[PDB]
Design a protein around this ligand. Structure first.
Ligand code: TF9
Ligand code: ZN
Length: 257
């Protein structure tokens, strides 16, 4: 099936998933100087107090921390969003080296990695139905650079030896994702897509300006992960990112001057 190699990589995806060359594909380059401050943007409300992690999954693409999205416990609202969006999962995309890994770029700049806190609109009832809708998902994009450790990322780093290969999963309760947030909620926003197949055009994107600092050792653990399944030739999970896509008929709004 699809992957990130020479033969199944992003440039091959359009064959099985035509929308890949569609009209609102993610990620994009964020031209910070082309983006308009939008006064009419309401403030971003990130309400992660009752957030309930359950499991961590290696799906052979990335790893997902899954949350109990059976009630309004950890929600994204305000900003550009109309209604309430439930956190289902977060995952990263990262590089073979520190000079790459991010999917979104800022004035063509690539970060070491990028966090997707994935939420779905509660008016659609569930995630599968939400991705069928243009306003179905809100993804909170956060850039990772290498420097200081993120203390609140270490619990996730420590358990990754337990989910080394495709398919493997671990109980992962009580993780507080507020420890992955930067200081500032300043953000760009655009209409966009899932960045992997099926690349559905169901995403309101919210990328924070302020990156979080992770340690080289924290990112080195992500790179020790495996695309392949247990008992298979070792392919290291690195450069699991989609390059920037054509902006087409889209304006990127900013929450700040
Ligand atoms: C753009 C973006 O953030 C996003 C892309 C795909 C999906 S999905 O297809 O609904 N999720 C998964 O089942 N897999 C996950 C995701 C892709 C890597 C981590 C693993 C969810 C969010
Ligand atoms: Zn993602």
């Amino acid at each position: 099936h699809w992957g990130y190699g020479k033969h199944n990589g992003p440039e091959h995806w359009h064959k099985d998933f035509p929308i890949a060359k569609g009209e609102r594909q993610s990620p994009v380059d964020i031209d910070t100087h082309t983006a308009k401050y939008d006064p009419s943007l309401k403030p971003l409300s990130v309400s992660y107090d009752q957030a309930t992690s359950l499991r961590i999954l290696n799906n052979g693409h990335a790893f997902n921390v899954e949350f109990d999205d059976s009630q309004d416990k950890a929600v994204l609202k305000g900003g550009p969003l109309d209604g309430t969006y439930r956190l289902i999962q977060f995952h990263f995309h990262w590089g073979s080296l520190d000079g790459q890994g991010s999917e979104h770029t800022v004035d063509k700049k690539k970060y070491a990695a990028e966090l997707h806190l994935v939420h779905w609109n509660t008016k659609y009832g569930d995630f599968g139905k939400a991705v069928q809708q243009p306003d179905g998902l809100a993804v909170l994009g956060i850039f990772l650079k290498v420097g200081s450790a993120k203390p609140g990322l270490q619990k996730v780093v420590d358990v990754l030896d337990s989910i080394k290969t495709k398919g493997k999963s671990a109980d992962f309760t009580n993780f507080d994702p507020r420890g992955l947030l930067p200081e500032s909620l300043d953000y760009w926003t655009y209409p966009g897509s899932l960045t992997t197949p099926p690349l559905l055009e169901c995403v309101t994107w919210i990328v924070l300006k302020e990156p979080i600092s992770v340690s080289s050792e924290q990112v080195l653990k992500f790179r020790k992960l495996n695309f392949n399944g247990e008992g298979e030739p070792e392919e290291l999970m690195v450069d699991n990112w989609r390059p920037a896509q054509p902006l087409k008929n889209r304006q990127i709004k900013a929450s700040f001057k």
